[PDB]
């Protein structure tokens, strides 16, 4: 871009280039889905998605209250989310199985399936990530008021 640098890109809307702190190798990040991929990547009316939610609290209620179901911190929740992403990408675990096993959403019962929806129904961050995903693609950690999600667009 600058006179002393190689020129470059497209990067469809939402994408940006970055560097691996570990290898110095370039990779691409989508700031809407928060997904990362090595390959240069280079909207629809309804989409169907499945997700895995990891809740966290920051609440701090008085002694009189019953113990809360969710006690982990946001940091701990993000660590769990990143670990699941790694296991799914490495083919070590299947998205559906992990969702059924660890998702804190009531949809865990349906292997994480939320069904088909249009814009206006889901929390904005979730909605934006879902519609920016390609069919069959998975998001990176997505933050909403419900907690941290991993989203898989199935349709």
């Amino acid at each position: 871009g600058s006179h002393g640098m190689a020129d470059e890109e497209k990067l469809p809307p939402g994408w940006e280039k970055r560097m691996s702190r570990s290898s110095g190798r370039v990779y691409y990040f989508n700031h809407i889905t928060n997904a990362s991929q090595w390959e240069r990547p280079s909207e629809p009316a309804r989409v169907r998605c499945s997700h895995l939610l990891v809740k966290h609290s920051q609440s701090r209620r008085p002694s009189s209250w019953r113990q809360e179901k969710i006690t982990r911190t946001k940091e701990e929740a993000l660590e769990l989310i990143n670990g699941y992403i790694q296991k799914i990408k490495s083919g070590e675990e299947d998205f559906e199985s992990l969702a059924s096993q660890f998702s804190d959403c009531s949809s865990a019962k349906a292997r994480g399936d939320l069904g088909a929806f249009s814009r206006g129904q889901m929390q904005k961050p979730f909605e934006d990530a879902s519609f920016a995903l390609r069919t069959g693609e998975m998001s990176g950690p997505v933050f909403t008021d419900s907690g941290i999600h991993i989203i898989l667009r199935t349709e």
Partner: peptide, 7 residues
């Protein structure tokens, strides 16, 4: 949010 490398 600082992103994690793809692998």
């Amino acid at each position: 949010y600082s992103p994690t490398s793809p692998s």
